[PDB]
Amino acid sequence: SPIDSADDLAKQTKIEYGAVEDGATMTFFKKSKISTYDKMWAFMSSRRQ
Amino acid sequence: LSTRIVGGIWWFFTLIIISSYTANLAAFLTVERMESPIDSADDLAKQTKIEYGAVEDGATMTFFKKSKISTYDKMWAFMSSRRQSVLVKSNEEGIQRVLTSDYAFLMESTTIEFVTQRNCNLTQIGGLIDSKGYGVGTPMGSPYRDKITIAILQLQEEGKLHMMKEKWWRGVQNIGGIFIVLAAGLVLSVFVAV
Amino acid sequence: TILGFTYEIRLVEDGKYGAQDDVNGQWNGMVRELIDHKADLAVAPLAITYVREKVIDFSKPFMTLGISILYRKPNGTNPGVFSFLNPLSPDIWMYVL
Amino acid sequence: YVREKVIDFSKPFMTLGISILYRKPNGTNPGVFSFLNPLSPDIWMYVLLAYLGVSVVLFVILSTRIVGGIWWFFTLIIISSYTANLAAFLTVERMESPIDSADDLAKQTKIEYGAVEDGATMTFFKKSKISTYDKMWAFMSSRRQ
Ligand SMILES: C/C(=C\C=C/[C@@H](C)C(=O)O)[C@H]1CN[C@H](C(=O)O)[C@H]1CC(=O)O
Ligand SMILES: C/C(=C\C=C/[C@@H](C)C(=O)O)[C@H]1CN[C@H](C(=O)O)[C@H]1CC(=O)O
Numbered sequence: 001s002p003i004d005s006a007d008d009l010a011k012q013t014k015i016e017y018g019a020v021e022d023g024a025t026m027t028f029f030k031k032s033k034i035s036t037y038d039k040m041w042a043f044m045s046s047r048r049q
Numbered sequence: 050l051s052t053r054i055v056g057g058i059w060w061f062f063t064l065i066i067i068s069s070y071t072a073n074l075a076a077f078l079t080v081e082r083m084e085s086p087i088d089s090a091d092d093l094a095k096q097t098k099i100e101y102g103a104v105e106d107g108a109t110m111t112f113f114k115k116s117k118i119s120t121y122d123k124m125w126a127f128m129s130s131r132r133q134s135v136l137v138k139s140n141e142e143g144i145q146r147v148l149t150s151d152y153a154f155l156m157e158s159t160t161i162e163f164v165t166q167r168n169c170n171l172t173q174i175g176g177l178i179d180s181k182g183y184g185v186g187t188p189m190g191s192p193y194r195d196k197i198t199i200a201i202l203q204l205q206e207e208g209k210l211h212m213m214k215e216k217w218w219r220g221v222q223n224i225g226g227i228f229i230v231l232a233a234g235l236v237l238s239v240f241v242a243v
Numbered sequence: 244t245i246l247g248f249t250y251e252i253r254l255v256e257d258g259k260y261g262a263q264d265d266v267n268g269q270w271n272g273m274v275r276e277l278i279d280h281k282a283d284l285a286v287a288p289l290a291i292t293y294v295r296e297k298v299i300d301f302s303k304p305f306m307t308l309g310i311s312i313l314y315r316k317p318n319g320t321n322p323g324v325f326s327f328l329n330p331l332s333p334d335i336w337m338y339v340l
Numbered sequence: 341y342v343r344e345k346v347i348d349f350s351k352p353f354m355t356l357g358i359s360i361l362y363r364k365p366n367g368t369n370p371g372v373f374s375f376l377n378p379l380s381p382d383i384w385m386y387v388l389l390a391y392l393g394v395s396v397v398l399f400v401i402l403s404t405r406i407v408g409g410i411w412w413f414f415t416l417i418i419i420s421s422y423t424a425n426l427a428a429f430l431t432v433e434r435m436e437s438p439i440d441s442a443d444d445l446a447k448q449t450k451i452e453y454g455a456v457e458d459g460a461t462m463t464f465f466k467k468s469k470i471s472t473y474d475k476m477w478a479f480m481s482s483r484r485q
Contacts, residue, residue, distance in 0.1 A: 177309020184304035186285020226324035
């Protein structure tokens with residue numbers, strides 16, 4: 001289905017997603033313990049390059 | 050000769066139309082039947098579209114604080130992230146938030162049983178996540194300090210506390226429309242037949 | 244009926260089943276009500292909490308329960324005729340006409 | 341190792357593993373003895389009334405062409421709807437599968453699964469680092485009571 005949330009961004013790994021390396025991004029969900037943002041952090045750190 | 054080809058063209062054109070309609074109807078019924086509602090606490094532990102919460106100032110929040118379940122820990126992390134935004138103090142504030150907004154409210158089974166007897170629009174999800182007792186504190190040397198397990202336990206065995214508990218809160222369609230359209234077509238055919 | 248004692252049921256002055264403040268360490272609410280010269284005897288259960296069970300003579304709970312989720316339920320129906328009302332456009336029915 | 345560091349064991353006379361006992365999927369066999377394996381009988385009563393109305397129309401009687409067209413479209417819509425419902429039921433049947441491994445049990449939370457209270461199996465799952473067994477142990481600790 002159409003995505004409409006970051007939860008479905010965490011669910012769907014076919015669409016690649018990331019952010020800026022340094023700054024507020026990649027630090028907010030790095031320290032976060034919410035499972036959606038933790039899975040998104042794991043996916044982004046898997047594709048850090 | 051050409052009229053037979055014309056009728057065959059209409060025949061498989063109508064076949065193509067009804068095959069497309071059958072495919073769309075099958076897709077709609079499949080996506081409707083594939084959907085599932087919330088039926089566990091792990092649904093709230095994973096899905097973050099529906100915001101949730103509890104009361105403030107401890108009680109359940111203390112069990113969130115010292116949680117070791119590692120899914121209840123995720124629920125505590127989300128609730129601490131949304132402590133200032135989506136969280137209420139009393140039970141009635143969260144209960145109306147369930148009815149108004151897409152909100153789920155974590156409570157004891159007694160109050161949830163009370164509001165589901167009160168309103169038929171409410172439902173209970175999940176079993177006993179954290180086993181919680183309710184009692185009455187007692188003086189030192191009080192008779193009911195020992196008689197909570199002796200006399201008040203005997204009143205519970207006689208069900209008088211259960212008598213108070215049971216005293217206070219106690220306890221097609223589109224096819225028919227298609228048939229209506231068919232009857233209207235029968236009416237039109239009789240009106241043509243006059 | 245157990246004892247025959249006299250009692251005056253009264254509202255609490257804080258309105259809280261109070262926990263502590265970790266910036267101060269003092270325990271407030273009903274826990275402070277048992278230390279602020281009202282009743283050294285325990286009164287309120289504050290449900291079950293571990294430090295609340297460390298109060299002077301916390302009795303056994305008479306009632307047992309658990310924590311679950313209250314959630315409103317969704318409901319919907321499809322009355323009338325909806326074979327003509329597919330997610331496909333009515334211009335397909337115009338093409339049929 | 342929690343028992344080996346306290347008392348002494350011999351060499352094992354036999355070796356074994358831990359696996360899943362489950363009820364066999366043979367049984368609950370659908371047939372015409374079991375009711376409502378096809379759809380609801382209200383639609384069948386409605387099409388019996390439709391055939392009765394068609395017989396009434398043929399009794400009381402260009403116009404027959406549009407009677408046949410209306411009957412053709414009505415029956416075609418009803419059979420297409422039954423086909424779509426049957427296809428949706430078969431798709432949600434084949435979409436689910438019987439459990440074949442531990443991760444298959446870990447994904448589907450419809451079937452409850454646990455072990456013996458404080459046994460060596462639950463001790464193994466508590467001290468497990470693989471994510472499938474960690475998820476299964478998290479599910480077991482969720483329903484530990
Ligand atoms: C896009 C961006 C920085 C990008 C590149 C360089 C200059 C850096 O990260 O230092 C900013 C935008 N404002 C953010 C902040 O204020 O932290 C910062 C990173 C972000 O987008 O979160
Ligand atoms: C509403 C409430 C706690 C939340 C906020 C304030 C009012 C407080 O007691 O500090 C209480 C009511 N009785 C429960 C208890 O004794 O633990 C607790 C919430 C509940 O679990 O229903």
